[PDB]
Each structure stands twice: as C-alpha cells, then as structure tokens.
Paper text:
Unexpectedly, we observed 3 molecules of kindlin-3 forming a homotrimer in an asymmetric unit of the crystal with each protomer dovetailing the next. Kindlin-3 trimer adopts a triangular prism-like structure along the noncrystallographic 3-fold symmetry axis with the following dimensions: an outer-side length of approximately 110 Å, an inner cavity width of approximately 60 Å, and a height of approximately 90 Å. Each kindlin-3 monomer adopts a cloverleaf-like overall conformation. The F1 domain resides at the center of the kindlin-3 structure with the F1 loop wrapped around its α/β barrel and interacting with other domains. The crystal structure of kindlin-3 trimer also reveals that the additional α2PH helix in the PH domain of protomer A directly wedges into a cleft involving the 2 C-terminal helices (α1F3 and α2F3) and the β-sheet (β5F3-β7F3) in the F3 domain of protomer B, thereby forming extensive contacts. The residues Thr467, Ser468, Val470, Gln471, Ala475, and Ser478 in α2PH of protomer A interact with Ser595, Gln599, Trp600, Ser642, Thr643, Leu656, and Gln659 located in β5F3′ and its preceding loop, and α1F3′ of F3 domain in protomer B (the prime ′ refers to protomer B in the trimer), respectively. In addition, the C-terminus of α1PH and its subsequent loop in the PH domain pack against the 2 C-terminal helices and their connecting loop in the F3 domain of protomer B, through H-bonding (Gln443 in protomer A with main chain of Phe640 in protomer B) and salt bridge (Arg447 in A-Asp653 in B) interactions. In the kindlin-3 trimer, the F3-integrin-binding site in each protomer is occluded by the α2PH helix of the PH domain from the neighboring protomer, suggesting that trimer formation could inhibit kindlin-3 binding to integrin β cytoplasmic tails. Although kindlin-3 monomer binds, albeit weakly with the dissociation constant (Kd) of approximately 200 μM, with integrin β1 cytoplasmic tail, kindlin-3 trimer does not show any detectable binding. Therefore, we proposed that the triple mutations Q471A, A475F, and S478A (henceforth referred to as AFA) could disrupt the protomer–protomer interface in kindlin-3 trimer.
Recently, the 4.1 protein, ezrin, radixin and moesin (FERM)-domain–containing kindlin family of proteins has emerged as key players involved in integrin activation. Kindlins cooperate with talin to positively regulate integrin activation. Talin binds the membrane proximal NPxY motif, whereas kindlin binds the membrane distal NxxY motif. Here, we report the crystal structure of human full-length kindlin-3.
Author numbering: 14 to 145, 173 to 307, 320 to 326, 350 to 484, 499 to 666
C-alpha cells in the first residue's frame, strides 16, 4: 500500500485560483471531482460543474478515465467551474436577452439548446456569431408548451414583431454601401463544430443569433411564432439597411406588409371568480430538480381524486396502493387553459412541497370531464372537498360558460418602412398612398401569414441566399469574391459585379477544404475542380457553409428532425468521441 503520488492544482471561485489536491497518475477523473469538492468545503450545487484543462484545449466529459489517460500531470493548469455560463445573445430583431449557454457542448449542440429554450424549431438553420432582458432556468426534455412554459413574471416579446424604427436613425445606422463591406458579417461566424471555449469566448461575452442557412424547412404559421418573427425581422433589417436590395415597386409591398403586421400586433376571456373522481387523464409532470432528469411527453395516466387528494396510475388493477404521485392539494395554484375551438382543456397545479413545487399539467377530453376536475381542484385548493354544495354550484358555472362553440365568435403611419435610398429619393407623401394602395391586397392576412408572405417575397429577390466570402481564387490575381447560396456557389469580379463562374452544388463531387496552404478545393463532376484561398474572411466557415447547405435540403421527408449529429460533424471534417 505504497503510493508516491503527485499534486494537482484545481481552481474555483468566480475568479481563477483555489486549492491543490493530491492524486496519482492512476486516479479517476470522477474521483478527482470528489477530491476537489471536499478540498474546498463549500455549500453549492455542482450538478453542472466540470473541469477545463486549458493547456490541451479541452475538458473531460469522460468521468471514468484514468488521469494518465488524458496525459495530465502537475504541469498544466486546471480550472474547476460550471459548464453553463451566462451570455448576452443578441437576437436578429435587434434586441437581446441574457441566458446561460453550454460552453461544454460543441456549438451546433449549444445553439440547438438555445433555440430549444427560445421555442425556435429546426435549430440547424441558426448559429452563433462573434462580436465585431431576463436570466435563465433549466428545462431539458423533448418539448413542452402552455404558451412556451416560461411560467414566471418575465415574458419578453421575442415572438411579437418590434415597432418600426424612427426614420431618424434608419439613415444614421451603418449600411452596406458595397461588396467587401458586405462580406464582413460572414467573417464573424463561430465554428459550430468545437465547444464555445475553443473559440475564445469568456464569461460575460456578447453573441449574435442570426439565421445562417437560407434554406428554411416547414415554415408553419401555427407551430413557430418565435422562429417566424425572428426570421421576418432578420429579413426586414436586411431590406431597411440595404443588405439585400429590391425594386421600387417591391419596397411598396414590403412596406405595406410591415404596416399591416405592426398594425395587428397592437391588439377567450376567462374572467371568473368565486365522492370520488376517477378518469383517464393525460398527465405532464415537471421535476422540481430537473438537472439530471428528462421528462417524457404527455403521458396518459389513470388519475383518482379522493376527498381532496389526487393520485395517478397507469391502470386500474395497479391502484390504489401503488401510485406514481401523491399531492397535498391543500396547498394552492390552479390556473386553466381552455380553447373550446381547439379542444385544449389543460389545468396547471403548482403543489407546494418541502423539496420543491411539483408542477403537473393535466389535460382532459370533453368540457364535461374538464368541468368536474377543475371544480374539484379549485375547491381542494381552498380546503373544501367535492362534497360542498358549491362544488355542484361551481360545475354549473363552468359548463354554462363553455356553451359558446364556434359559429360567430390606420393612423397614416410613417415612411420608415422603406430603405434609406427610397426616403431620400421619395418625399414622404406620395409613397404613403402607394403603401396603402398595395396594402389592400394583404389586409385580409393574419399576422403569421402576412409575416410568411414577407419572407415569401423576400425569397423571390434575385440575390436571396448569397453570403459573400471575398477570397482569392485559383489562377487569378485580383482576389475576386465567392458568395455561398445554398444550391450554388458563384464568383463575382469584386468591382465589375458580374458573375464570372456559376458552379452548381448538384454537380459537386466530394471534395473538402484542407491543407497547410489554407485553401479550399472542390471537385465538381467532369473533373472540373476549382480551388480558392481565404482572403481576410476565413477558411473553415466556408467549408462549414458548403457542407452545411449540403446537410440541409437532404433532410427527412416531412418531419425533418432527429438529424444525425455524427453526419453534421462529418460535413465539417474530423470525428471525435
């Protein structure tokens, strides 16, 4: 039982210095964690904490490996901190909100978790952008909803469009003005293949969430109010700032839509006040401590509500002695969600427990099944049972209200809806009728369908899709520009502006960027292979756009999720464990 071990230095503390523990070369990474929690004697929740190991540019998710396996010795510095650090996350609607993001996951997983928080479906089309208001929580599950279960006092407007700028600063803001001034934005993309710390992003940094791939999948005006609003608002701010130009009569339909959607963003009523129950309800649980617990989807469970108390099971023969939960509803907090034309009959109950409120979302089928349960839960929350005369006098109130069942249910705005070159060339008077004239076609549109057509008309523009990486090319001086564009990749004479070479993506054979020469090489069927080198923008985000767009457009048929992550990393090169 002889050891003769070495000593390691492990940091802590919002700053960077803590303490030193003693381990062998044979020590387990997970064992070093326990030795480092005892060596400080703090009262925290390290559930998310991990180690950093700067010198070799990566951490240790492998909790079990030997310390000699990573090659670590007493030499190189160690950092014990959290994996989730707060970030500023600038939105594409020119607002911002503070959230915690994963520095430990590779960026494509980090952005996916961010969009997952922000109700942004299909996160493969978005990415984080480098530098040139509510805090966070934890969810960790497939997908949950009431509006987006954000239940707190902070509900910021990222789903509703932002008011239009005053025409004062719409001209004072920086504009594109030419190519090679347009290629700067795409020089700030982060590599969505390495973690967030391999990119040099520290604790308080700012990050931008822009749409990266101009190939949008299943734009549903019902499923994604946040994904739609942010996309539309990225498009307008590429029109109002001349990042993508349109024609004189298209700015009119663009301006007419911005007015119509903004006019409707500026505008049932559950205004109400004050023996067993056995049914098959559909239950949705929420762990108070969800850091190590996922939840399944809406589970259909056999619920029993007796005298006050509620238990639920999965079958009647598995009752009553073997429940899944048992709640002291003698507490409080039942809030409803009823959409008679949508058949949503959901009740939220916040059950105060010593460990933490157990959040459960019950959902019934008919108005009559719903009226019985919510009346029982609203009186159980008041102490009384279903044996009160007011319980039947509360069920009456519900069904009486649930009788209506779906048969009958200007201000002269600015000229700031148009780009700056249309307000210096047009007086603010003769485009106002032309906006209102072209507005009559879209006045019959809903907020999401009118937003959708703004993106549909933005998709029709002749230069929709191009990303402009100005990089040198194969046999040419003058270092012309490239541009990406999902289904193509072109070449432009930088100053002339003409399109010299138009290579198609479908004729592209399998070639990838690699070398010491820092130059990309693509093969292109019929052995016509083009090569170019990075001029001042970058060389890996070009290979990320190419493989990225190739990942897109070849997804699942209708329900395009569950994408192969070992394939996305494959389309940006190199495999990892």
């Amino acid at each position: 039982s002889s050891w003769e071990l070495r000593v390691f230095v492990g940091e802590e503390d919002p700053e960077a210095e803590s303490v030193t523990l003693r381990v062998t070369g044979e020590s387990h990474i997970g064992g070093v964690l326990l030795k480092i929690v005892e060596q400080i004697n703090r009262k925290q929740d390290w559930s998310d904490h991990a180690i950093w190991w700067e010198q070799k540019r990566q951490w240790l998710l492998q909790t079990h490996w030997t310390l000699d396996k990573y090659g670590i010795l007493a030499d190189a510095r160690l950092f014990f901190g959290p994996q989730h650090r707060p970030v500023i996350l600038r939105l594409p609607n020119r607002r911002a909100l503070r959230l915690r993001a994963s520095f430990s996951q590779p960026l494509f997983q980090a952005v996916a978790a961010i969009c997952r928080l922000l109700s942004i479906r299909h996160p493969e089309e978005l990415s984080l952008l480098r530098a040139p208001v509510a805090p966070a929580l934890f969810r960790g599950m497939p997908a949950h909803f009431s509006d987006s279960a954000q239940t707190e006092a902070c509900y910021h407007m990222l789903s509703r469009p932002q008011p239009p700028p005053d025409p004062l600063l719409l001209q004072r803001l920086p504009r594109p003005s030419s190519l090679s001034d347009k290629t700067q934005l795409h020089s700030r993309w982060l590599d969505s293949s390495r973690c967030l710390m391999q990119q040099g992003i520290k604790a308080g940094d700012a990050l931008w969430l822009r749409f990266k791939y101009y190939s949008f999948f299943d734009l549903d005006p019902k499923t994604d109010p946040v994904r739609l609003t942010q996309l539309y608002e990225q498009a307008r701010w590429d029109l109002l700032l001349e990042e993508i130009d349109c024609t004189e009569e298209e700015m009119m339909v663009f301006a007419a839509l911005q007015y119509h959607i903004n006019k409707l963003s500026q505008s049932x009523x559950x205004x109400x006040x004050x023996p067993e129950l056995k049914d098959h309800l559909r239950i949705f649980r929420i762990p108070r401590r969800p850091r190590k617990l996922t939840l399944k989807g809406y589970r259909q469970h056999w619920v029993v509500f007796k005298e006050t108390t509620l238990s639920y099971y999965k079958s009647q023969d598995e009752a009553p002695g073997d429940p899944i939960q048992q709640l002291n509803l003698k507490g409080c907090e039942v809030v409803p969600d009823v959409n008679v034309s949508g058949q949503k009959f959901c009740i939220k109950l916040l059950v105060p427990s010593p460990e933490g409120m157990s959040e459960i979302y019950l959902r019934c089928q008919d108005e009559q099944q719903y009226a019985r349960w919510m009346a029982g839960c609203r009186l159980a929350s008041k102490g009384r049972t279903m044996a009160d005369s007011s319980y039947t006098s509360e069920v009456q109130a519900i069904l009486a209200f649930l009788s209506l069942q779906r048969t009958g249910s200007e201000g002269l705005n600015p000229y700031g809806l148009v780009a700056p070159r249309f307000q210096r060339k047009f007086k603010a008077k003769q485009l106002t009728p032309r906006i209102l004239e072209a507005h009559q076609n879209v006045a019959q549109l809903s907020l999401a369908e009118a937003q959708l057509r703004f993106i549909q008309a933005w998709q029709s523009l002749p230069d929709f899709g191009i990303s402009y990486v100005m990089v040198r090319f194969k046999g040419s001086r003058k270092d012309e520009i490239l541009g990406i564009a999902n289904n193509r990749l072109i070449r432009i004479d930088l100053a002339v502006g003409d399109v010299v070479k138009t290579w198609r993506f479908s004729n592209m054979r399998q070639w990838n960027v690699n070398w010491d020469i820092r130059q990309v090489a693509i093969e292109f069927d019929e052995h016509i292979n083009v090569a170019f080198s990075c001029v001042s923008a970058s060389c890996r985000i070009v290979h990320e756009y190419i493989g990225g767009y190739i990942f897109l457009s070849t997804r699942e048929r209708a329900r395009g999720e569950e994408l192969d992550e070992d394939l996305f990393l494959q389309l940006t090169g190199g495999h990892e464990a």
